[PDB]
Amino acid sequence: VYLDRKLLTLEDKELGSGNFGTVKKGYYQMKKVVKTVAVKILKNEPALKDELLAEANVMQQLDNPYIVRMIGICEAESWMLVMEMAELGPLNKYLQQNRHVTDKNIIELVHQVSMGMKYLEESNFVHRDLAARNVLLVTQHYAKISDFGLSKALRADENYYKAQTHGKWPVKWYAPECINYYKFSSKSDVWSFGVLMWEAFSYGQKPYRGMKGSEVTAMLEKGERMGCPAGCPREMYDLMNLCWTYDVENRPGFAAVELRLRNYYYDVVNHH
């Protein structure tokens, strides 16, 4: 969807940045209402342009309440990817600044991410960058998945994407089959989801603190896993460990993961 630059008003202040460029807040004149938007603007000082168009192409095919919606793209001063705004920002930064969010509220948010991911798995897309920094909050009780720059639409005849090259990769969120065989499936996004849960219950702390990527691989190969975060319910730590199943075949899919979270969340809703 090609947008009209005259209908977009960008605020000068940056909200953040990545290798791509910056994220800025703006407003888009819709059919009637004005919609607040988050705009990804390329640095471009053609790989980044191709990558932004491929990201746009993925987001255009997705339609789920727990996935960030793309409004469209615009070619002006630079290439821009216009999305609905998630005002409260990334989940890791939010939890670092709001250390009193309850365990019930964290389960609600991670269950919303599992719903978005169950839908992505059903749609045969692999995220490949599923981490708390890429979970954006619309409200303190409404999370959405974003950042589809590494995402891939699976071929009709395969359950995984085989990467040709390898880097720069967020290794700490990657399953052993991604590191060892360059194979990315919805099951490897399940492994990432386990790391995301650990981050959420650790109030946005970095996983595998003080370790190099190679030491993380060595740790996992020995069957070792990160410990239970302080105050994290045993059932949630158990689910993290299940996500962290070394053998992809035995690892659950997002249908099993979302069902476990849903049932635990209803149990919690009952106790409260």
Ligand SMILES: NC(=O)c1nnc(N[C@@H]2CCCC[C@@H]2N)nc1Nc1cccc(-n2nccn2)c1
């Ligand atoms: N649709 C959105 O609203 C949105 N989509 N994608 C991203 N990506 C970011 C890239 C850089 C790393 C974070 C995140 N994955 N950001 C967004 N909105 C935002 C809002 C407030 C603060 C910040 N923000 N960015 C950095 C710090 N705060 C970002």
